Design goal:
This is part of a larger assembly, with 3 copies of chain A and 3 copies of chain B.
Chain A: H1 15-22, H2 29-33, H3 37-41, H4 48-61, E1 67-68, H5 69-77, E2 81-82, H6 87-93, E3 97-98, E4 101-107, H7 113-123, E5 136-141, H8 148-158, H9 162-165, E6 169-173, H10 177-193, E7 196-202, H11 208-211, H12 218-238, E8 242-247, E9 249-251, E10 256-258, H13 261-267, E11 270-276, E12 281-288, E13 296-302, E14 305-308
Parallel strand pairs in A: 4-8, 4-11, 5-6, 5-7, 7-8
Antiparallel strand pairs in A: 2-3, 9-10, 11-12, 12-13, 13-14
Chain B: no helix or strand
Classes of the chains: A alpha/beta, B little secondary structure.
The structure holds adenosine-5'-triphosphate (3 copies) and calcium ion (6 copies).
Chain A binds a DNA duplex through helix 12 and helix 13.
Chain lengths: 311, 16, 311, 16, 311, 16
DNA sequence: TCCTCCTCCTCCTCCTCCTCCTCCTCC
DNA sequence: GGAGGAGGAGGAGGAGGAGGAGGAGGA
């Protein structure tokens, strides 16, 4: 796991500074190591002398140098892939939703974005034997569409204590774009204590369409969104959780591309495009991925969560 | 803030 | 190859100073020769008297004067051009990715930037007979999208020991813009020992969009990026490797120009603009080059790396 | 730093 | 031509002093005549007594007094104007690139700055009948973008021995700003022996963006650039060559002004602003000139060098 | 320094 | 089987050398 | 033949850099 920031005091850092760091969001040694010198300067009780000391000491505790692809292929083969509750869909993702990375699921309305997030919020607690993550879930919701009764329906499918599953889902309703980012700083604190295995922001860009209106606020909208997506990438490296954000769509009138622009297209590693099939069937499609080939699968929304096409 | 139950650590979901 | 800095002691330089130089990034006689007098002064245990001695002695070991275009056309005709794994694409580049220079590959998401870097990281190890570089690869990755399983898929195509190919790729994950530059100083050390033939920074400008936010930090962003691109140009001259950086894009709302501004447009010698074709086909295009004509080619991403349009 | 395998010198990739 | 400095010994100067002058950059009587008394004092083995003698004797050998505009209009009408390889472009410059003066070509990337310098480096060897300079070329390159294969392509157009043309281009790669200036002292030596007709520094200000970082080094950056541009102006008067420097651009964020500031705007006599036209066409524009009117022309980059819009 | 060919004097480029 | 319009955003530091000057009294 | 005394008085500015960021179906 990640080393807590308290281990910096044992290396020659004033316990007052650690408190000044922990008031800035940093809670692990990694979070301070990965941080630039610029960020630590922006802290009040920190100067360029301290920041150079903090960065130097923290760098000794976490590897930040070169290795070999062999040593990386080894460490990567032991990465957790959470099942989506669909044999047909996991065969598309070659295992399931991959941890330590940002995954994006966009599509028109009803295409099952929120439904996949509810299934993931349950199956991330199964033992790895059964294809899960053996951890809690963190469901940031910017729409008011978090339904606990949909988590119970999936727990019944996998035979889990519905009362116990709802204890492992830390729910938080974001009301604007500033609050949505504030919830991530509090999120970095919780993941140090417990063991969360899945972070869900649904929808990640819902509140950016309205808080930032026209083109006159376009530049500020993407720069604020870029910091959010960057702060998610930091959580994926600090704790090795799985970040699964959902995205809305927009028509092109010159036939539905996702919003967020190039800021969210480059940041996310895996993009899933969900269409409407027939009846209760849907069609997921590897829109972008570093490793997976471009292909389509057909899942469906059933009364017990996301599952294979029951037909 | 944090809920008095959200601060609680993970629990392996018992079977049923 | 490049002469190691230890050859300065045999010319009247205190072995203590060489240690004070090697603690500043310089590891070859070239790195000290190409360096300005200003940089050596900025070192602590070095004064204007020593620096004038160091520059004078080092200049005797490496040619830094005029020649003729005839002597340069001869020396250039023996330059290595790494194949891209696509006959149609190499015919566009008139040989392949040229060493001793900075090449840039920009485009929207999914356009195969990371995929080309994975193919290059493999084909740079083929013997020159087969169109490679007969050297190791160095893959600095600022996004977390380095997949070793994509290197094995390309090794199977060219019939190479997949276990041996992954031993020749020195991978390093940069977490911010300061760390991204720090990795280049450590990079100059490794290239003295082994024989690297390809340096890859993907993405070179990913972390500059978020570490430096608005326009208020624009000036500092480009000056920090200019030093990075300059430090790459130094590696291309020290060791004659091939620098292949990738770049993100941005929309112009006044229809996708690359980011980085004029700082990265002037610095890079070859720019490749990658579009999305149809299905799995992509369209590369000589955006800028000193010698190559403006033209387009059509490659594709296949299950065995980048290859010709398998259609 | 440097990996114990990154410091190793180049190896001509054997065929397969 | 210019008188060599050896003619000072025949006028009562110690042949030891001439050796002490030639070790300071001066190789012609002009270079010593145009020099201030301050520069000769800064030489070690030279005192105020000698310097007054050196300046007095040298002034007798070269005219440094008043004349008439009639005698100057006569001497100017016999000045050489090198063709740019484009009838449409030469009609803009009213003859071509004018010798005995500093010409600047700035613009965004790909706008054909390096391409014009390659065409000029060839057409400066044509006989004056065909519009050239009947001399060698000197191509100082601070970017690594000197391609001899682009000189051969232009020699084929004008029907010249491609092997002979590459013998008349003295190429030198500058690696920093100190080295860039050092190459000019060695340049003054070569021009005394042979007959160079064109000096090219491309890019003249590329290395000044990175060697001198922020505003804290701004003053030192321009004073170092002012000496360089002044040392070029001296070569244009000593030998009557044609100095053609290229310049990068920078955006103004308050839409692309050239870098270098007022130091390079006043120093250069002719400034050419190169835009991107359509396809392979470009648009040059008299940005500043003492005589030429403000106007635009349209040239293009062809497989045989810079030429008229082949459309 | 100077190349053994850069020190050579100018040559009128012969036709071809 | 066709069709079109929209806008705003700030921050950045470092830089050294310089010379000449004169009159005065008593025991 | 004898016997040293007394400081004054400031000048004089240079030198620009560096772009970002798409949205929105109609009938
Ligand atoms: N318990 C259930 N059993 C079966 N189908 C259900 C159930 N609950 C919801 N659905 C179906 O799933 C779809 C809703 O999907 P979901 O809530 O994921 O939408 P979404 O993609 O998040 O949409 P939006 O952009 O509006 O938020 C609808 O077709 C709905 O009828
Ligand atoms: N093994 C594979 N076989 C076939 N296609 C693949 C494979 N792996 C990835 N792809 C495809 O290649 C593309 C991904 O390209 P790549 O990873 O180079 O993106 P990129 O240009 O780096 O994007 P970004 O800016 O998001 O990082 C997608 O179309 C994906 O479907
Ligand atoms: N042989 C050729 N035939 C046709 N077009 C060419 C040829 N070589 C280069 N070009 C084109 O000329 C342009 C390159 O111009 P050039 O090398 O002068 O750039 P530049 O202005 O010096 O740029 P930078 O600031 O990046 O150095 C590109 O559009 C390139 O496609
Ligand atoms: Ca929803
Ligand atoms: Ca992406
Ligand atoms: Ca990528
Ligand atoms: Ca360029
Ligand atoms: Ca150029
Ligand atoms: Ca001018």
């Amino acid at each position: 796991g990640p080393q807590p920031i308290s281990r910096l005091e044992q290396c020659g850092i004033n316990a007052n500074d650690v408190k000044k760091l922990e008031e800035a969001g940093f809670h692990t040694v990694e979070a301070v190591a990965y941080a630039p010198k610029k960020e630590l300067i922006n802290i009040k009780g920190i100067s360029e002398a301290k920041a150079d000391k903090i960065l130097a000491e923290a760098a000794k505790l976490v590897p930040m140098g070169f290795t070999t692809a062999t040593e990386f292929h080894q460490r990567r083969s032991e990465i957790i892939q959470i099942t989506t509750g669909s044999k047909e869909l996991d065969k598309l993702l070659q295992g399931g939703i991959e941890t330590g990375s940002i995954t994006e699921m966009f599509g028109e309305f009803r295409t099952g974005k929120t439904q996949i997030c509810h299934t993931l919020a349950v199956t991330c607690q199964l033992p790895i034997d059964r294809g899960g993550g053996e951890g809690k879930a963190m469901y940031i919701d910017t729409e008011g569409t978090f339904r606990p009764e949909r988590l119970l329906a999936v727990a019944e499918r996998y035979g889990l204590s519905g009362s116990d599953v709802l204890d492992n889902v830390a729910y938080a309703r974001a009301f604007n774009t500033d609050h949505q980012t504030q919830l991530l700083y509090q999120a970095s604190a919780m993941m140090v204590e417990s063991r969360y295995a899945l972070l869900i922001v649904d929808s990640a860009t819902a509140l950016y369409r309205t808080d930032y209106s026209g083109r006159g606020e376009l530049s500020a909208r993407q720069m604020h969104l870029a910091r959010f997506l960057r702060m998610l990438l930091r959580l994926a490296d600090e704790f090795g959780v799985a970040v699964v954000i959902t995205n809305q769509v927009v028509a092109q009138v010159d036939p539905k591309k996702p919003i967020g622009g190039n800021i969210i297209a480059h940041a996310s590693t895996t993009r899933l495009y969900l269409r409407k099939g027939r009846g209760e069937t849907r069609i997921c499609k590897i829109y972008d991925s570093p490793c997976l080939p471009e292909a389509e699968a057909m899942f469906a929304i059933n009364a017990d969560g996301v599952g294979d096409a029951k037909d | 803030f944090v809920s008095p139950a959200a601060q609680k650590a993970f629990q392996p979901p018992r079977s049923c």
